[PDB]
Amino acid sequence: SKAAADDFKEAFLLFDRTGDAKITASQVGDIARALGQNPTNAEINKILGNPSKEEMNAAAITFEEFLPMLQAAANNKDQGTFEDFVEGLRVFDKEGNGTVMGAELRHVLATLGEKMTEEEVEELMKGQEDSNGCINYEAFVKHIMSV
Amino acid sequence: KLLGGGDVDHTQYAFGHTKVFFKAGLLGLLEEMRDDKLAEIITATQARCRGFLMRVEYRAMVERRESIFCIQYNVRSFMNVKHWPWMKLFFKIKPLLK
Amino acid sequence: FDETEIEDFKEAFTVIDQNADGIIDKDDLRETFAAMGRLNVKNEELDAMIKEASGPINFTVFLTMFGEKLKGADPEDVIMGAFKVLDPDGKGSIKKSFLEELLTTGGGRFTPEEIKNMWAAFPPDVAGNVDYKNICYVITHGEDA
Amino acid sequence: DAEMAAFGEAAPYLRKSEKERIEAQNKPFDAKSSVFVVHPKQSFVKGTIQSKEGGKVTVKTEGGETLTVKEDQVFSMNPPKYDKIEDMAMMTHLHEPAVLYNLKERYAAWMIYTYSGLFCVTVNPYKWLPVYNPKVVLAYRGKKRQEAPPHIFSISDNAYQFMLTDRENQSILITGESGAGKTVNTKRVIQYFATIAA
Structure with missing residues (x-):
């Protein structure tokens, strides 16, 4: 709205590697996340196809399409409730203390639903899981929602 | 051990000596609804992660910024120099020094 | 330029300036080469070294000429710093294909053709990216050790 | 394959080669x-x-x-994964036909012992088999029914086991029509006891 945030246009100049002021359709998922929006990858996929937009063939962009797609994704930020994120992992391990065994969270984050690479899974556990093999998800989900 | 993972109803099944037992078709129905409900819950929780994941990549890319250059230029020198009389000289000579 | 590297160039300037007056002339170049074993050093080689300067080779003219040729010169401790960050678990020499991919995909200075020239006198291990350390030696002091 | 040795000669009538299996479970299937x-x-x-x-x-x-x-x-119709299932009760398709059909298939392959829950179904061979084989007897000795293929000595040994393990008495109920050949089994079970604990 501007509140006209012109820093979204300045961040589009940091993600366009050619400097022509266009951003390919394959970068739009990760740049919506870097502007403070977490649409799921199936949602980013649907919307695209919904608009008869094929992410399979070469794509370019213009700021005039990327701005309204970020504004259509911005209504879905009401789905980011931290009660359900901590209660999900609280149902994932027994006893009254928030600890996932290391390999349980790593294999679930790579193979269940939207596949996260094991390189990204190791980069998200690095520091929050110590050598006991127990990830405290009270501080883990706190630090994941700090970015 | 496998069933350890998944955002699945750990109820709906039951194990025994030769096999597991599984519901469908109601409990089957339940789960399904549930399934969608995690994509939500999940799909949204994935994103941030994804987001966040790359957000750390930028902090690294950036750090790296110069250490590369340093490495970059630094090599180039050598490729040029190593063939220079004066530099070979310095080289054989560099040792006699203290 | 760190100060010990500038003191190394001051010691090399004193070993080539055998008249000890502070200016390396063509006679100093020829008598330093003859004391290293070069009995056949041509006058055209001495004239090509003097043709790289606009004036007499005093200590600051020798430092500015070496500065302008070594604008990416890196000491061995900072090259081993960067190679310890590339091998952050320590000890192991890093893979050949990992250094080829990371040189190219990060920077234009790491483009391939240049990577074939890196493997070409920096031998296999060095080229490959497995050993480590011998390349830091030959980047600070050239030729085979 | 590796396992089967004890039987070896009987094997083919107890279990199938590890690819015969594989070639059967891993095949095209159109459920719908x-x-x-x-x-x-x-x-x-x-x-x-x-x-x-x-x-x-x-x-x-x-x-x-x-x-x-x-x-x-x-x-x-059950996915191919359930071809000649040892325990039909593991099938995900508890029908009338699927049961008939499972028995039938593993019979045409000369397997007379197939389980259907707790039962131990047994089909009259009408010919001779190396099953009552003096090697088998041992083989089935000290084995839970999950450690070995469907067979009567399984039942018969487990009984014994269970007998000493739980300190409870046991029973075996053999039943079928006039021509089913129970005496034969009964007798055969009996020998089993006598042998393995005489």
């Missing part, structure tokens, strides 16, 4: 179309669903026949 169906002459034969009359069904046959039968004259 493949089915079992009612049949006026033969009880239940298999077929492929052709069309759908809204509550009638037309199916091709395995022999080549086309019948339009009710919706509930039609029964699903």
Whole structure:
């Protein structure tokens, strides 16, 4: 709205590697996340196809399409409730203390639903899981929602 | 051990000596609804992660910024120099020094 | 330029300036080469070294000429710093294909053709990216050790 | 394969080669179309669903026949993963046909012992088999029924086991029609006891 945030246009100049002021359709998922929006990858996929937009063939962009797609994704930020994120992992391990065994969270984050690479899974556990093999998800989900 | 993972109803099944037992078709129905409900819950929780994941990549890319250059230029020198009389000289000579 | 590297160039300037007056002339170049074993050093080689300067080779003219040729010169401790960050678990020499991919995909200075020239006198291990350390030696002091 | 040695010679009548299996479980399957169906002459034969009359069904046959039968004259067919299942009760398709069919298939392959829950189904070979083989007897000795293929000595040994393990008495109930050949089993069970604990 501007509140006209012109820093979204300045961040589009940091993600366009050619400097022509266009951003390919394959970068739009990760740049919506870097502007403070977490649409799921199936949602980013649907919307695209919904608009008869094929992410399979070469794509370019213009700021005039990327701005309204970020504004259509911005209504879905009401789905980011931290009660359900901590209660999900609280149902994932027994006893009254928030600890996932290391390999349980790593294999679930790579193979269940939207596949996260094991390189990204190791980069998200690095520091929050110590050598006991127990990830405290009270501080883990706190630090994941700090970015 | 496998069933350890998944955002699945750990109820709906039951194990025994030769096999597991599984519901469908109601409990089957339940789960399904549930399934969608995690994509939500999940799909949204994935994103941030994804987001966040790359957000750390930028902090690294950036750090790296110069250490590369340093490495970059630094090599180039050598490729040029190593063939220079004066530099070979310095080289054989560099040792006699203290 | 760190100060010990500038003191190394001051010691090399004193070993080539055998008249000890502070200016390396063509006679100093020829008598330093003859004391290293070069009995056949041509006058055209001495004239090509003097043709790289606009004036007499005093200590600051020798430092500015070496500065302008070594604008990416890196000491061995900072090259081993960067190679310890590339091998952050320590000890192991890093893979050949990992250094080829990371040189190219990060920077234009790491483009391939240049990577074939890196493997070409920096031998296999060095080229490959497995050993480590011998390349830091030959980047600070050239030729085979 | 590796396991089977004890039997070795009997093996083929107890279990199938590890690829015979593999070649059977890992094969093409079309669930939505493949089915079992009612049949006026033969009880239940298999077929492929052709069309759908809204509550009638037309199916091709395995022999080549086309019948339009009710919706509930039609029964699903287990994925190939359940070919000659040791325990039909592990099937995900608890029908009438699937049971008939499982027994039948592992018989045409000369396997007379197939379990159906707790039961130990036994089919009259009508010929001779290395099953009562003096090697087998040992083989089945000290083995839970999950450590070995469907067989009577399984039942018979487990009883024994269980007997000493739980400190409870046991029983074996053999039953079938006049020609099913129970005496034979009964006797055979008996020898078993006598041997393994005399």
